[PDB]
Structure formats: structure tokens, C-alpha cells
Symmetry: C2
Subunit: 85 residues, 2 copies
């Protein structure tokens, strides 16, 4: 990649530019968005982002030692297709 | 979960509410944000969201039939910790 790592800060700048919205506002939106995705996953919600992918909490049964649960992302078809060479 | 599936549309509403920003603006920001994450992954960038997790393109070598590549998400520690029971 020309830019090897794109950060949250880089994305705020790119989104401010693309939308013409204030950087201060985009920054507040991104932090709130991630907080709300977290909150939803903590409640056991699926977080479905049409056209992008789904976050969900997956479980490992105790057999697997004790039962555990963890966050995961299932990429959508559009995203899978765009990342193919 | 009280809300079994949280959608992109639900998140726009939750973020508008939390930030006091206009729904039209939050909607534009979210669509741009996801587009820019996609674009970065298509270029082979890592997308690092401090405090949330990292998206990256992973490869399967041809041995595995032909070589393939696919998007993946590695959740960060904070998110992993919040999703534990």
C-alpha cells in the first residue's frame, strides 16, 4: 500500500474532506460511533452494517476449559469482492 | 440482547443523539467512513482504530488451489474485555 497504516485520525481527515464537514464534528461522530458499536456488542447485539459487514459476539463452549465469548467481524460480500486482487 | 440487531440506520440515530449533530450529517459521515475503510483495504492498507481494533487483508497461499486474499478484523483489547461476561 502507498499508505501502509491508515489510522482513526487519518480516517477523520479523509471523511472531513469527502463530506465537507468540520473535522471537530467528524471526530466526535467517529468516537461516538465506535462507542455505540462497543455498547451494542457488550449487550450481545449483532451490529449489521449493510454493504460492509457484521459484528457479533461469538461463543466458545466450556468443552473447547471454561466457556468464553469474543467479538468477531464477518465481512460482507461487497467488501470481500473489493479486496480480491 | 434487548435489541437483537443494531443496524447502520440505528447507529446513525444513536450517534446523532449522543453528539447532537444532524442526522443528515451523521448519515453522510458513516457512509464516507465505511467507503474510506473499504478503499484503504482495497489498497492493502491496515486500518487501525485505536481502542477498537484493526482491519487488514489476509492472504491464503496457493498451497492451502489458488492464492486468495480476504478482509479480516482483529479486535483490540478494550473491545475484547468489554464483551466478556
Amino acid at each position: 500500500a502507498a499508505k501502509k497504516t491508515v489510522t482513526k485520525a487519518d480516517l477523520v481527515d479523509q471523511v472531513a474532506q469527502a463530506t465537507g464537514l468540520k473535522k471537530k464534528d467528524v471526530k466526535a461522530m467517529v468516537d461516538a460511533l465506535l462507542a455505540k458499536v462497543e455498547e451494542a456488542l457488550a449487550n450481545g447485539s449483532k451490529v449489521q452494517l449493510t454493504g460492509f459487514g457484521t459484528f457479533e459476539v461469538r461463543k466458545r463452549k466450556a468443552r473447547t476449559i471454561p466457556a468464553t465469548q469474543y467479538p468477531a467481524f464477518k465481512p460482507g460480500k461487497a467488501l470481500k469482492d473489493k479486496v480480491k486482487k
